[PDB]
Design a protein around this nucleic acid. Structure first.
Lengths: 124, 157, 127
RNA sequence: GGAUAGUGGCCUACCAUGGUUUCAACGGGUAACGGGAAUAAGGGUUCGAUUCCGGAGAGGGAGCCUGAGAAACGGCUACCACAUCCAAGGAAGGCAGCAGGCGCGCAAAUUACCCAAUCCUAAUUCAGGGAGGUAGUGACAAUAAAUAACGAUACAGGGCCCAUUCGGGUCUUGUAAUUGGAAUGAGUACAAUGUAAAUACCUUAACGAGGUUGGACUCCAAUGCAGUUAAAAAGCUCGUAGUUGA
RNA sequence: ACCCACUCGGCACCUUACGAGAAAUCAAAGUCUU
């Protein structure tokens, strides 16, 4: 598609809040799942906005938070945690179309496909 | 699309090495099981982790594998694909002078010429290991490789 | 009409309101026993002090997270391909989990009878 | 006792009443023909090879046949039946050991080559071996996955790309120009692992020996559930079966 | 006896600082990643 590649191990993957919930309440090993599909070392991360949003969810749905605050995902310190998870990831990946995005938000995925060179992952 | 820009990537590797197909598919799947079975470390040091260890680790390889480390060979999943590619004559036989430039290479690999220290090796996608012997052999004689030995300084990687 | 979720669904049914726990069923070697494995792993406070008809043994102070709900469950299998699988009931692999199984020997916990390779019935699951 | 060649209720008798059996016996019901190797810390793997094993059919029936040795299929007969040749008169004939056409009709390669082995039978040899083998056919299942490019020069328009709207990017690109090796393919002895013959078809060896789409010549991408509603609560209560049930 | 408060019985209702569901409504259909 005319997109010049320069991705190198370990892949940087932003995991969104929905994916985190999902993998938690269905017992899906998110870390190993990504290393499996990317077939290489992966650094799994979550923006501060995504994990904050989880924090609210965490008030009545305990379990996502702990996994989401795990070193496996390493925090990506965005400048705008206040912005919906969706917009957060979008504004972070818009300058760094480098990072792979794992999201359950088919709306966020659609608007990321626009940007050349953004691997997209999700759970069926 | 990612499908699209992928179908770009592949064509990139399509002479990032030299192929013409989906041997990129070959090497790919390889990388899978390599990782895969491997990544299924998991686990401990089960005397199994042991044999499998220095085992898959004895992937090395020459022209093949990594360099000196691991353990964690998923690095390969990064490489391998993007590394296992070279190694073999398909690659590491242009990067040795003889071959004027990939193309001007596979052709001799085939066309009788180009031989791995005794016996040709038409299988224009062998694999290299302890290479210093990858001469022409030839047995009036293999011309394209016998005089154009500008490889007389092919100190490359 | 079922002393299990009966009272675990009062602790459950409580900490969600938030408080200092309350009364429950009647006692049950089992009630008391889960209302043990709980405490012993944490979660709950101190099983309590009642004694009546069968109303005996305990109330039981709350304390701590314990969020949310003790798990009641209403079938019963176990072991190997099992236990691990019904460990999907769990609120996530990476620790957290606890599945208060029933183990041929001992009313035990997802690991507490993962112990000496045990199995059997599936009594419940905590936090 | 008699058969049985010779064991046996197997029968001649002769009588014993026996005994089988819920551990289900009598018994029933499952078209049932019917089922060997070894490694192996763990793993690695795998086998014998579409049943190692192993009873009952070779029109019907009968009786009979050989014999060391048949319930003799592929011996008879005779009988039946079919079922046939005919100078009238008589005088045939049962290849699930093959192939073949019908059919069946679901479903699959010439009525190849040799007994080259290695096995067969077999009489004092080297009989004969429908064994076996060899083929072909044959994605059959197929695989393989390797098949025009490497390079000489000029000539140069300026480029060509962007999302581009204008900006930007920067810059080879055409020769329907002039070089490359005695590139290589295909034929020729070439004996042949070699169907002692396939043994020239292999493997050689060589001898010789390169020509999808879209876009007007053009043009471009692969050779366990919401549950009121919105689809599913008998009036009302009673309750059995059932469901569960310190 | 009347009333008064106050209790505890349980009366039914009514109500939502709670839980719902797919929403109007619900102290249930609140109700165990939905």
């Amino acid at each position: 598609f005319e997109h010049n590649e320069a991705l190198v191990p370990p892949y940087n993957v932003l995991v969104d809040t929905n994916f985190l919930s999902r993998t938690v309440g269905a017992k899906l090993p998110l870390l190993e799942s990504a290393m499996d599909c990317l077939y290489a070392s992966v650094n799994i991360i979550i923006t501060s906005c995504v994990m904050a949003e989880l924090e609210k969810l965490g008030p009545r749905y305990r379990v996502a938070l702990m996994i989401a605050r795990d070193e496996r995902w390493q925090r990506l310190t965005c400048d705008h945690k206040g912005t919906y998870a969706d917009d957060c990831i979008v504004d972070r990946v818009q300058k760094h179309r480098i990072y792979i995005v794992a999201t359950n938000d088919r709306d966020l995925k659609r608007r990321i496909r626009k940007i050349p060179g953004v691997p997209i992952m999700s759970v069926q | 699309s990612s499908r699209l820009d992928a179908e770009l990537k592949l064509a990139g590797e399509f002479g990032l090495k030299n192929k013409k197909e989906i041997y990129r598919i070959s090497f790919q799947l390889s990388k899978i099981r390599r990782a895969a079975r491997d990544l299924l470390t998991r686990d401990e040091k089960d005397p199994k982790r042991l044999f499998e260890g220095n085992a898959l680790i004895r992937r090395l390889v020459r022209v093949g594998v990594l360099s000196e480390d691991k353990k964690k060979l998923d690095y390969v999943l990064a490489l391998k694909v993007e590394d296992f590619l070279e190694r073999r004559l398909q690659t590491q036989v242009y990067k040795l002078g003889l071959a004027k430039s990939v193309h001007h290479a596979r052709v001799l690999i085939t066309q009788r010429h180009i031989a791995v220290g005794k016996q040709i090796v038409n299988i224009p996608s062998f694999m290299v290991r302890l290479d210093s012997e990858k001469h022409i052999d030839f047995a009036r004689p293999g011309r394209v490789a016998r005089r154009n030995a500008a490889r007389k300084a092919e100190a490359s990687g | 009409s079922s002393v299990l979720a009966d009272a675990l669904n009062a602790i459950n049914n409580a900490e969600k309101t938030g408080k200092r726990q309350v009364l429950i069923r009647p006692s049950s070697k089992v009630i008391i026993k889960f209302l043990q494995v709980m405490q012993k792993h944490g979660y709950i406070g101190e099983f309590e002090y009642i004694d009546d008809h069968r109303s005996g043994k305990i109330v039981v102070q709350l304390n701590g997270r314990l969020n949310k709900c003790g798990v009641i469950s209403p079938r019963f299998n176990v072991k190997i391909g099992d236990i691990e699988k019904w460990t999907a009931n769990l609120l996530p692999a990476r620790q957290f989990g606890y599945v208060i199984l029933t183990t041929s020997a001992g009313i035990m916990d997802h690991e507490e009878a993962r112990r000496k390779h045990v199995s059997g019935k599936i009594l419940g699951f905590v936090y």
